[PDB]
């Protein structure tokens, strides 16, 4: 009908933008300066400029697209030829269209379009190459003459040669080139749904995705995933019957992005409900253990600081050989009231990532792991779950005492410099995943732990036990009953009680969420000295028996106090005498385990 090839080159050289001068012409020529192996297609351009050149792009696609980079390829060689013999592939990367699939919403009624998905990368293969096009010889003591095999089309996942010598047109053989090979470089990947969409209940969604040639591995396993591709029909050993009628799709995402924000909110409905706290900082989080009425008026701290340090990170940074604080670890054992994990769920409503670890789990699941078999049979392993999902968020553990060995040893790398580096069958994956770690303790013999250490119950931790920053015990579901319903009569004056009762749970969270990226945290006044004074002086002499040495505790307080800073800073205050008062919780909780 009408040449789509001229439509293309024009809506390409014509095009003006948001500066109103030309979008694509001096990228054109930094593609042309640089080049580079992709295109920059922004959708809104086209769909402005011609009604119809965009429909057939969204539909059309499969076609569409092959003939889109002929073109691209044909001007830019008038622009610059010297672009041949190095780049015969253009590749044009679409990007912004409409069609936003949820993981596992994609049926039938999408097979073959082009569409972009959101999600989290889940496991990356290593570099690879394949083949596009071949330059065969039809050895013929007449021919012997080689030629590009693949004319006009682009060769299958499995294929064959042409009798008819492209040359001679006669049958004989043709010995296949290295030489004058067409090479992509290929990376498989899988899509893994949005914990936030992944229904309760319901198991993660992971939908097969494909990167190639300048795409590879430009995104780190573990990662926001917006993913525009297309999709088809994908097999192992087929044509072959056997039964496998059925086989999964085969996402193609051509043009991806790595995000580095979170998901929004309305209109902050309680920054004057921020004075009113100001009465107790904290009126907010002792809503959050009350929200459990577990707590009630005979609320415990630490449910707050799990808190303070949930909603606050304290987040710390600092480019001293690198070191990236969280609220840090947060450890709880026992049979008692393990009820957080409700609110876990809840608190930051909005947490990008909150693993409820029945969490042995699935075995890749649980923290880091690239494995050199079965990998090859359903994901060349690149698993990782609890530890990598969590990235930046809050993690589950409701059975920490069952851990694999150094996939605890690397458990401290990752709690230790947010981020582990595994290397050894071909890549080395390194994702830096820094979230905060909450752990709930199989109750191992809650007995004499009064005037001790912390080395029984968990009987994993030896080391990796004081990579943490807080302390919680919860024992007899005899003795202790009574005398906690007790206190509520007690102190009942014990005044964050329903006071600020309005933690709307999962709303109040919301907030308590909507905290986290932008209060942003406050430097220090003179309390940072005062405080180094608590952290002099309380620093004489740190040391208990058999080689359980405060003699790294020097960084081990860092932390510590640092999030306390920042804790009170769950909105917009940290130098305040105010927020160093915690310091001095975050000193009677260092006594509390010390005797």
Not at 356 to 372: D, I, N, P, Q
């Amino acid at each position: 009908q009408i040449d789509y090839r001229d439509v293309f080159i024009e809506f390409l050289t014509t095009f003006k933008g948001n500066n109103n001068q030309n979008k694509y012409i001096e990228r054109i020529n930094e593609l042309v300066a640089y080049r580079k192996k992709s295109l920059i297609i922004e959708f809104s351009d086209v769909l402005s400029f011609n009604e119809n050149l965009a429909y057939e792009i969204i539909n059309n696609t499969k076609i569409i697209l092959p003939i889109l980079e002929g073109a691209l390829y044909d001007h830019i060689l008038q622009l610059d030829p010297t672009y041949q013999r190095d780049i015969e592939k253009v590749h044009v990367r679409i990007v912004g269209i409409p069609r936003v699939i949820e993981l596992r919403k994609i049926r039938s009624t999408d097979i073959g379009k082009l569409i972009t998905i959101d999600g989290i990368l889940v496991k990356v293969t290593p570099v690879k190459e394949r083949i596009y096009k071949a330059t065969y010889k039809h050895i013929h003591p007449d021919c012997m003459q080689e030629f590009e095999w693949p004319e006009d089309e682009e060769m299958p996942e499995v294929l064959e040669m042409p009798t008819i010598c492209p040359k001679c047109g006669k049958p004989g053989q043709f010995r296949l080139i290295p030489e004058k090979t067409k090479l992509i470089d290929w990376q498989k990947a899988v899509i893994q749904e949005r914990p936030e969409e992944v229904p309760s209940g319901q198991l993660p969604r992971q939908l097969e995705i494909i990167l190639e040639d300048d795409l590879v591995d430009s995104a780190r396993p573990g990662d926001r995933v917006k993913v525009t591709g297309i999709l088809d029909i994908k097999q192992d050993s087929p044509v072959k019957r056997g039964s496998r009628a059925v086989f999964d799709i085969y996402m193609k995402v051509s043009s991806i992005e790595v995000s580095q924000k979170v998901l929004d909110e309305v209109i902050i409905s309680e920054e004057d409900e921020k004075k009113i706290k100001d009465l107790a900082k904290d009126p907010w989080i002792r809503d959050r253990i009350i929200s459990s009425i577990a707590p009630s008026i005979y609320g415990h701290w630490e449910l707050k600081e799990a808190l303070a340090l949930a909603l606050f990170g304290g987040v710390p940074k600092v480019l001293e050989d690198t070191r990236i604080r969280g609220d840090i670890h947060i450890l709880i054992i026992g049979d008692p009231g393990t009820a957080k994990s409700q609110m876990l769920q809840f608190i930051s409503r909005v947490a990008p990532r909150a693993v409820y670890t029945t969490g042995k789990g699935s075995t890749a699941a649980g923290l880091t792991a690239a494995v050199v078999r079965e990998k090859g049979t359903g994901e060349y392993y690149l698993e990782a779950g609890a530890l990598v999902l969590a990235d930046g968020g809050i993690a589950v553990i409701d059975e920490i005492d069952k851990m694999r060995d150094e996939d605890r040893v690397a458990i401290h790398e990752a709690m230790e410099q947010q981020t582990v580096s595994i290397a050894k069958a071909g890549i080395v994956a390194k994702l830096n995943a820094r979230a905060a770690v909450i752990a709930a303790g199989n109750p191992k013999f809650g007995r004499y732990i009064s005037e001790r250490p912390v080395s029984d119950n968990i009987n994993l931790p030896p080391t990796i036990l004081s990579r943490f920053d807080l302390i919680f015990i919860l024992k007899d579901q005899p003795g202790e009953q009574d005398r906690e319903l007790a206190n509520y009569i007690l102190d009942v004056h014990s005044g964050k009680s329903t006071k600020n009762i309005i933690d709307i749970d999962t709303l109040r969270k919301y907030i308590a969420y909507a905290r986290k990226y932008v209060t942003p945290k406050i430097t220090s006044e003179a309390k940072n000295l005062i405080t180094d004074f608590f952290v002099e002086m309380r620093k004489k002499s740190s040391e208990t028996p058999d080689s359980p040495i405060l003699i790294t505790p020097r960084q081990l307080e860092a932390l510590i106090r640092i999030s306390e800073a920042y804790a009170k800073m769950a909105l917009k205050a940290e130098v305040t005498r105010e927020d160093a008062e915690r310091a001095i919780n975050i000193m009677r909780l260092f006594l509390e385990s010390v005797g």
